[PDB]
Amino acid sequence: GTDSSQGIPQLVSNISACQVIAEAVRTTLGPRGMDKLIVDGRGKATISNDGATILKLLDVVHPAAKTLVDIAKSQDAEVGDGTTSVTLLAAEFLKQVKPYVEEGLHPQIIIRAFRTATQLAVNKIKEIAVTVKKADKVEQRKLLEKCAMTALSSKLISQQKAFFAKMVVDAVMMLDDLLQLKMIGIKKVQGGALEDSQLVAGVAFKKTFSYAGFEMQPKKYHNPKIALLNVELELEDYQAIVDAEWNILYDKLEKIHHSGAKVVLSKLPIGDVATQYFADRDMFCAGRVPEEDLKRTMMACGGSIQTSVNALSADVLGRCQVFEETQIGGERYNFFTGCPKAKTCTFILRGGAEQFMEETERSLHDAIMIVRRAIKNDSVVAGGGAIEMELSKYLRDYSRTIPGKQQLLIGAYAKALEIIPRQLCDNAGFDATNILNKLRARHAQGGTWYGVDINNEDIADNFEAFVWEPAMVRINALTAASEAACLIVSVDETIKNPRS
Amino acid sequence: TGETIRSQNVMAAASIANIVKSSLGPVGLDKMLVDDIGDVTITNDGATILKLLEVEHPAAKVLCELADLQDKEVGDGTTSVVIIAAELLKNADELVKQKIHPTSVISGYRLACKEAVRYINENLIVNTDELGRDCLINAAKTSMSSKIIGINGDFFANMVVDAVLAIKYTDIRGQPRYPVNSVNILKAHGRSQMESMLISGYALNCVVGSQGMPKRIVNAKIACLDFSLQKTKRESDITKERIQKILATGANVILTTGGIDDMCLKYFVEAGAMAVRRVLKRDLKRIAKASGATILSTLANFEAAMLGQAEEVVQERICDDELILIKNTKARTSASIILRGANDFMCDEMERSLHDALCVVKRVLESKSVVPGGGAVEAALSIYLENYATSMGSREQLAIAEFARSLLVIPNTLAVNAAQDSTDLVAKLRAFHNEAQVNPERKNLKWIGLDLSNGKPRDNKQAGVFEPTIVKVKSLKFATEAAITILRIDDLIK
Amino acid sequence: QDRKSRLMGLEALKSHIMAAKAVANTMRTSLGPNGLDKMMVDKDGDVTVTNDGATILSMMDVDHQIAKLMVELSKSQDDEIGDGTTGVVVLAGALLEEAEQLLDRGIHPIRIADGYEQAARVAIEHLDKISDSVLVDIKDTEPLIQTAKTTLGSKVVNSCHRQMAEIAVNAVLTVADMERRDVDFELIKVEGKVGGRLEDTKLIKGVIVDKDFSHPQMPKKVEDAKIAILTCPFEVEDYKALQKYEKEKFEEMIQQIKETGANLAICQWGFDDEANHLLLQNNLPAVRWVGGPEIELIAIATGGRIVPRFSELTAEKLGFAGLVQEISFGTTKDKMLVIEQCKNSRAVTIFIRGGNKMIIEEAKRSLHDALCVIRNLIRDNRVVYGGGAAEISCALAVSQEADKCPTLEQYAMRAFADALEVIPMALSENSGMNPIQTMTEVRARQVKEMNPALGIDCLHKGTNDMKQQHVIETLIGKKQQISLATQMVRMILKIDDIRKPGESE
């Protein structure tokens, strides 16, 4: 048995389970964090880096541990980032005040102190918040491209990094209509090089056997639209079933020039070994949908949905601009580009190594989000754990200026901020102390936006290294962390009532 | 189970410091010192606690030994030099659990104490001059707070500060040193305690010395004796001849301590001499060292010039008595506070309140360089070292920071033992010394310490709460030395 | 009886490193040409003996998920190289064993991993520096024998390894699209028949189907371009009228076929063969009851394409045949189908008629690996001297750049050097010599003399020179190996915690 009663017996095991579930997203903070491996039972080893996709698939069974992951489920549903920070910071808010509760403090006092420190924290972020939106971002966009370079600066792909950046700032700004990651779905292709990687205004999908039949289509076409089918395409009264199957096999060819489509798209497999029977129809096809290939081309090109065997519509060959189908290092890919509602740009990931597929999914999938937030939000502040350090110093100076019980707790707030850079450098590999004291010296005397460098692990100036961060994102992040902290502090009893 | 000797030593030192924790301060509780042999011992001070404690751990014995090395210097401060050292042990363990080497923590403690003593010496107090007397008489008044004399005890405060300053010995090195015996306790039967006043010498309610001496016997030569002046069957019948012999060596006022003479009724007019039986040998030596008078048992031969001076012995009615005023003597041991009331019994605890009121102001005037008490120095030093750590930027930056919280344990324990809120008064005192730094004009909100009686944020310089600076400096030094030595014993799986 | 679930993430790296180094470096004695052939026993009925790594690490089943990830990515590396993956696994174990000491010394595994990557960025370019490659290798049919020498020289097939290399000189040439330079899933040079001997595997660039014949006295030696493939399935006097209807369904191929054109029109399913005897009077043969997916297999041997339907089998899209011959395909067993009469084969494939699984398993796959390294004589004609000779020189250069390098990457490079030095050690150990002295002596001979082709004499020839013995890999065959070892050593070092859903805490 372990302290299953009212008060400080209840809070200790809750903070213990909080630290236990913080261990599973501890080493995932930062761009060079470690990889968590969980295997599903039946043998699905999932090497995953983002804390949210760990946290959905984890072993969250405790009462108190479930009341952190839901606050993180809010935060990754808002933006899709900061999930491991709003758990680590929230657990550190409890862990720093963990020796303070058993010495004789009331939980509501340390809740109220958390709340007034959070109000000063969401105050002080705005008086140091910097807007850089008008200063050459949408016109003269290259400064926006400069902070695009931050995810791949001083690397081996740094040469094609500006080549990537000039295209991905267009992948933001030619599509900035309350953007989604569904709008930019990237596709890896073996062969080629990093110079040959490209970005189509549209989609790019490889043709397999069960995917799509006809090679060398009417690509150069000025209204190629698709038909979203749902039915098959491929192959004593015993003669009558053969006459029926001949009839159905000819009946499938009636959507061809009566309904008049160029590509049909069902979810059923097609035979590419006998392509000429479906090139007897002489029109392209598609089978065995991915839902991404479904709905991207649906929201972009807009072909009609069909079920009937002779289903004629207006969006079988409605208004789409172009089609393309080209070998990509040899490997022929579809291109349902040329779309009237084209919120679709697929990055062709050309390159020799397959293991750079995660790289643009780790760096450039976050770099596209960095410039997307640099456009969508304008009040920016530094990154690398400098803003939390400024908040910690300001709360440290506030706490000594106020008498009462909060004088410890706000200070216990401030050290609880400093889990942010210490876990960053330890996810990089540097010593936690010498990156912190050298930070705090010039941070308490010289300036504000001195932060942690990720490259050579020294004290850098991330405002000039252009590691921006949206101010309201940080506000909602530490607000959710403080709320998840005081939610656990306010819990003092778990009634179970199991069975009847 | 146990894997580090450092955790073992911090637990040993904390278990030592817990016993002297609730005895620090003037309202400390009792730690019962019962060993298994049958003794029962009740005390409230850490010196008698630790010196007779059956200590278990070796490093705990090292801490008690270093507390004893502190004990030979100034007396008190033993519980503070244990408690601050134990908190340094605890915070150093919390630091070295964060992959910090104890070398860095030891050097940080050293730099923190070296900076803290210069912080202290920049902000000490020498208000207790000869001009600083209202603060001194206020120190005298607040040292006897909430007592039965305290209305007339203000008049005792009027009569105790000139008692300690006026009779003050300039010593062989030319420095002020107050003997407590120079003002002698003296009851007064009859009239109640509301009129007690210091008289400039001793006035014993005794047998009258003579009737043939004037009010003012100017140039006395005290032949303080021992023998009873009687006849037998240079003198063998000791009544006249050696009395007249030492009077021929110049004895103006002979002081026979033994029994009376048969013919002193004729001798006490021509010489003007005294005869008081059973003179208090404390006060006999005191008025002897106030005069320079050779005590003689017999007189077979010093007698020429080493019989001492008294200016005036009045034969009048004080204490409703013919009081014998051995006063206005040569050296400054001539004073005795009168104690009205009925006896030494009704004003007995009042008399005890007078004696330690002498004893607190003699500690002020000796070692005139002084700091406020009440734990203001510890909170101000934590506020100092908090920014001093951030000024450094080295690896030891945390250590000075952990020097800060380990210094305010003394006002924390004072707030504990005074039945008040523990962390709240430390937070208020820490807040008051913040505007001693950030507000430039409010430098005179610096000595706001804790009330040692009732536990409230209060003045000390106006309140007269004082402690010698050499005591605080040496206690901080020895606490840091103890912390460094027990942190050095680290590299054992034990 | 109070089981734990915590994995202390430095000790968890030690656990993953030893879990690798159990599975990795088990195969350390199978490395090299003189390796020890492991036994493969399936848990149902199989008993085989093989030395090839890609067979065993697929067919073995490991317990830990670290080694499961190792063989899972090495399955994709089989699509990358398909040859010498045992060197990748041995280097994985070597780099992890060397990284264990740096993890004990205090280095973060991220720094060890990207220092290994930075050391690979030295070793690959130094491998490019020591490339003393031959560049004439397009029409080099006699140098192509020693190109394909050591991949076949480990067995007693050396009597026919000249013929087996001349198999490859015709194999690579007709598939040599001299821009794209690819053998594909459909360009497969594999058709193994059981029973026979060494040279019974020989050059027949044709289609060899083991079906029956149209008749036991059918004229089997046809020359025709009038071949066909029709998929005619089986899909009470009325049942006799139904048999007349099945007769007339065949008459689509009998009487309605001289205007249609399907004479050697072999059949797939149920049938009554006396109408095929009526065809035998017509002399239009029809092999009964053939399989499903062998249709484009047989419709390539003049360069044409597949017709599996009735009406699209026209005269331009008949059945197609390779080159005329009269040989008994089966000596005691039946002669198979002569699909060898007329013209060229794009999907070109070698007759393989051995009887022992070892030589046939190596001859199918190592000739495809030749078709990767002779692909690496047309895609990038750049070869290097293996046998540990290159592995010593790149270990010297990585230690050279480990002299002027910043702190923990430098320690990672100096671990990378002797982690690369295991490929001399294991290959010398499996031969039967001392593993530590023989590496040091030839490393000294490689450092006092400027020749980098001085490997370990594990063929037990005269000298340690790999030039005269022609033990030769490609620049890709070792560059891909080193990079694909480092790219997963970094993966294993990046993986710290393995929690197990099906949760057990």
Curated annotation (Swiss-Prot), chain A:
Belongs to the TCP-1 chaperonin family. Keywords: Acetylation, ATP-binding, Chaperone, Cytoplasm, Hydrolase, Isopeptide bond, Methylation, Nucleotide-binding, Ubl conjugation. There is a cross-link at residue 405 (Glycyl lysine isopeptide (Lys-Gly) (interchain with G-Cter in SUMO2)). The keyword Protein biosynthesis does not apply. It holds the Pfam family Cpn60_TCP1. Disulfide bonds: none annotated. It is linked to De novo genetic variants in nearly every subunit of the TRiC complex, including CCT7, have been found in individuals with a broad spectrum of brain malformations, and clinical phenotypes ranging from mild to severe epilepsy, developmental delay, intellectual disability, ataxia, and other features of cerebral malfunction. The modification N6-acetyllysine is found at residues 56, 295. Mg(2+) binds at residue 81. GO terms for molecular function: ATP binding; ATP hydrolysis activity; ATP-dependent protein folding chaperone; identical protein binding; protein folding chaperone; unfolded protein binding. This is T-complex protein 1 subunit eta. GO terms for biological process: binding of sperm to zona pellucida; chaperone mediated protein folding independent of cofactor; chaperone-mediated protein folding; positive regulation of protein localization to Cajal body; positive regulation of telomerase RNA localization to Cajal body; positive regulation of telomere maintenance via telomerase; protein folding; protein stabilization. It is found in: Cytoplasm. The gene is CCT7. ADP binds at residues 30, 82-85, 153-154, 384, 469, 474. Its EC number is 3.6.1.-.
Swiss-Prot record, chain B:
It is an enzyme of class 3 (hydrolase). Changing residue 26 to L: In IDDPMGS; uncertain significance. ADP binds at residues 25, 77-80, 146-147, 374, 467. ATP binds at residues 25, 77-79. Mg(2+) binds at residue 76. It is found in: Cytoplasm, Cytosol; Cytoplasm, Cytoskeleton, Microtubule organizing center, Centrosome. The modification Phosphoserine is found at residue 453. Its main location: cytoplasm. GO terms for biological process: binding of sperm to zona pellucida; chaperone mediated protein folding independent of cofactor; chaperone-mediated protein folding; positive regulation of establishment of protein localization to telomere; positive regulation of protein localization to Cajal body; positive regulation of telomerase RNA localization to Cajal body; positive regulation of telomere maintenance via telomerase; protein folding. The keyword Chaperone applies. The modification N6-acetyllysine is found at residues 187, 362, 456. CDD domains: TCP1_alpha (cd03335). Keywords: Acetylation, ATP-binding, Chaperone, Cytoplasm, Cytoskeleton, Disease variant, Epilepsy, Hydrolase, Intellectual disability, Nucleotide-binding, Phosphoprotein. GO terms for molecular function: ATP binding; ATP hydrolysis activity; ATP-dependent protein folding chaperone; protein folding chaperone; RNA binding; ubiquitin protein ligase binding; unfolded protein binding. Its EC number is 3.6.1.-. The modification Phosphotyrosine is found at residue 169. It catalyses: ATP + H2O = ADP + phosphate + H(+). One of its GO terms (cellular component) is extracellular exosome. It holds the Pfam family Cpn60_TCP1. Component of the chaperonin-containing T-complex (TRiC), a molecular chaperone complex that assists the folding of actin, tubulin and other proteins upon ATP hydrolysis. The TRiC complex mediates the folding of WRAP53/TCAB1, thereby regulating telomere maintenance. As part of the TRiC complex may play a role in the assembly of BBSome, a complex involved in ciliogenesis regulating transports vesicles to the cilia. Belongs to the TCP-1 chaperonin family. This is T-complex protein 1 subunit alpha. It comes from Homo sapiens (Human). The gene is TCP1.
Swiss-Prot record, chain C:
There is a cross-link at residues 189, 193, 240, 244, 357 (Glycyl lysine isopeptide (Lys-Gly) (interchain with G-Cter in SUMO2)). ATP binds at residues 32, 85-86, 387. One of its GO terms (biological process) is chaperone mediated protein folding independent of cofactor. SUPFAM superfamilies: GroEL apical domain-like, GroEL equatorial domain-like, GroEL-intermediate domain like. Its main location: cytoplasm. It catalyses: ATP + H2O = ADP + phosphate + H(+). It is an enzyme of class 3 (hydrolase). The keyword Protein biosynthesis does not apply. Changing residue 155 to R: Found in a patient with severe developmental delay, intellectual disability, pyramidal and cerebellar signs, visual impairment, polymicrogyria and pontocerebellar hypoplasia; uncertain significance; the orthologous yeast mutation induces yeast lethality suggesting loss of function. Mg(2+) binds at residue 83. Gene3D superfamilies: GroEL, GroEL-like equatorial domain, TCP-1-like chaperonin intermediate domain. It is found in: Cytoplasm; Cytoplasm, Cytoskeleton, Microtubule organizing center, Centrosome. The modification Phosphoserine is found at residues 5, 311, 504. Induction: Down-regulated in response to enterovirus 71 (EV71) infection (at protein level). Keywords: Acetylation, ATP-binding, Chaperone, Cytoplasm, Cytoskeleton, Disease variant, Hydrolase, Isopeptide bond, Neuropathy, Nucleotide-binding, Phosphoprotein, Ubl conjugation. Belongs to the TCP-1 chaperonin family. Component of the chaperonin-containing T-complex (TRiC), a hexadecamer composed of two identical back-to-back stacked rings enclosing a protein folding chamber. Each ring is made up of eight different subunits: TCP1/CCT1, CCT2, CCT3, CCT4, CCT5, CCT6A/CCT6, CCT7, CCT8. Interacts with PACRG. Interacts with DNAAF4. Interacts with DLEC1. Interacts with SPMAP2. It is linked to Neuropathy, hereditary sensory, with spastic paraplegia, autosomal recessive: A disease characterized by spastic paraplegia and progressive distal sensory neuropathy leading to mutilating ulcerations of the upper and lower limbs. This is T-complex protein 1 subunit epsilon.
